[PDB]
C-alpha cells in the first residue's frame, strides 16, 4: 500500500489532496487510515450539542450545500467550483452523504476527513440515512462490506449517531436535513436537549428533523413516506416567530433546479445531488450567506462524469 497515509496519526491538508486524487482514480484508503478517522470523527462529534450554534460575523461566508447520496465526483465538482474547505471557505452539508449513490465510501471519508482538519468551519449534520435501517436497504451497508467489513460499517454506524441535528446561524438562520415539526410549540432550546446519540424514533422532534416537507397549504399533514408530516406555511411563521429566527434551510427532496423558497421566503430547499442516480436529470445548488447579508444566494451546476458504476450497486 502506497495511498494516503495520515502525519502523526493525523488529517492534514497535502492527506486531504492526496485522498481526493486517490479516490478520483477509484482506489481505496487503507483500512487502519479509515479506522483512525473514524474514531478521530467520533471523539470530535460527541462534543457537539445536539443544535450547534455558529456566528458569522461580517466579512465571513459559509456555503451550505444539501444531500450529495454518494455522488462523489459532484462532490469534487462542488470543491472546484467553490473552493476547497478552510477557514475562510467554511461548509454545511446537510445530512444525506450516502446511500443511493454508489461513492458513499468516498464521499464520507472526504467530509470526515475535513471535518478533522477544520472542525469549526466545516460542519455535518444528520439526515435521515445516516440510520442503520436505511443503510442497511439503500446501499451504504453494502458498500462498506464490498470495500472494508461488517466491523467498519458498525463503527460508521455508531459515528453517525453523534452527528448534529440541526445549525443556527447568527441567531436567525436554521438548517436541519428535514424541516420543521409535527407539534407546535417546540423552542431552540428543546432542539439543543435531544438525545440524539441513537437511530431516531417512530415520531417526536428528533424524526422530524430528519423526516418533515413542507406543503403549500396551511395546516400539517400525514406524510405520503409513512413517518412526521408535511407542514404548511402557518407552521413556519409561528415556529419562526418563537424563536426569533428569518427563515429555515432544509434539503432532503429533489427539485429540477437544485433549490426552492417555500412559504413566501420562509422555507428554502437546497439540494446537491445533480442527475439525482444518473436519472432524475435535475440540477444541484448551493447556497451562500455572509455576515452583512443573510440571505440566500443560490449558485446552480450540473452532474459531471464519473466511472461506469451503476447507482445502488451495492444495495
Ligand atoms: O434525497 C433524496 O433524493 C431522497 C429522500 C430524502 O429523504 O432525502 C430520501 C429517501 C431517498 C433519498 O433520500
Ligand atoms: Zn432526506
Ligand atoms: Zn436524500
Excluded at 407552521?235 to 434539503?251: G, Q
Aim: charge should be negative.
Amino acid at each position: 500500500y502506497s495511498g494516503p497515509k495520515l502525519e502523526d496519526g493525523k488529517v492534514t491538508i497535502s492527506f486531504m489532496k492526496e485522498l481526493m486524487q486517490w479516490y478520483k482514480d477509484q482506489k481505496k484508503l487503507h483500512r487502519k487510515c479509515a479506522y483512525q478517522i473514524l474514531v478521530q470523527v467520533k471523539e470530535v462529534l460527541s462534543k457537539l450539542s445536539t443544535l450547534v450554534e455558529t456566528t458569522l460575523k461580517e466579512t465571513e461566508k459559509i456555503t451550505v450545500c444539501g444531500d450529495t447520496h454518494g455522488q462523489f465526483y459532484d462532490l469534487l465538482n462542488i470543491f472546484e467550483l467553490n473552493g476547497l474547505p478552510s477557514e475562510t471557505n467554511p461548509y454545511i452539508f446537510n445530512g444525506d452523504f450516502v446511500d443511493r449513490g454508489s461513492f458513499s465510501v468516498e464521499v464520507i471519508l472526504t467530509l470526515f476527513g475535513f471535518k478533522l482538519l477544520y472542525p469549526d468551519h466545516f460542519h455535518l449534520l444528520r439526515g435521515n440515512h445516516e440510520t442503520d435501517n436505511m443503510n442497511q436497504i439503500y446501499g451504504f451497508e453494502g458498500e462498506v462490506k464490498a470495500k472494508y467489513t461488517a466491523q467498519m460499517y458498525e463503527l460508521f454506524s455508531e459515528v453517525f449517531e453523534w452527528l448534529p441535528l440541526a445549525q443556527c446561524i447568527n441567531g436567525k438562520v436554521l438548517i436541519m436535513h428535514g424541516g420543521l415539526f409535527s407539534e407546535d410549540g417546540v423552542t431552540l432550546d428543546d432542539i439543543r436537549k435531544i438525545e440524539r446519540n441513537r437511530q431516531p424514533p417512530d415520531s417526536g422532534p428528533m424524526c422530524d428533523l430528519l423526516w418533515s416537507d413542507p406543503q403549500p397549504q396551511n395546516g400539517r399533514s400525514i406524510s405520503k413516506r409513512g413517518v412526521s408530516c408535511q407542514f404548511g406555511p402557518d407552521v413556519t411563521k409561528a415556529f419562526l416567530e418563537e424563536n426569533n429566527l428569518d427563515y429555515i434551510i432544509r434539503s432532503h427532496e429533489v427539485k429540477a433546479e437544485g433549490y426552492e423558497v417555500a412559504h413566501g421566503g420562509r422555507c428554502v430547499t437546497v439540494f446537491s445531488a445533480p442527475n439525482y442516480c444518473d436519472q432524475m436529470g435535475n440540477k444541484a445548488s448551493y447556497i451562500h450567506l455572509q455576515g452583512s447579508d443573510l440571505r440566500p444566494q443560490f449558485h446552480q451546476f450540473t452532474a459531471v462524469p464519473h466511472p461506469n458504476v451503476k447507482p445502488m450497486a451495492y444495495a
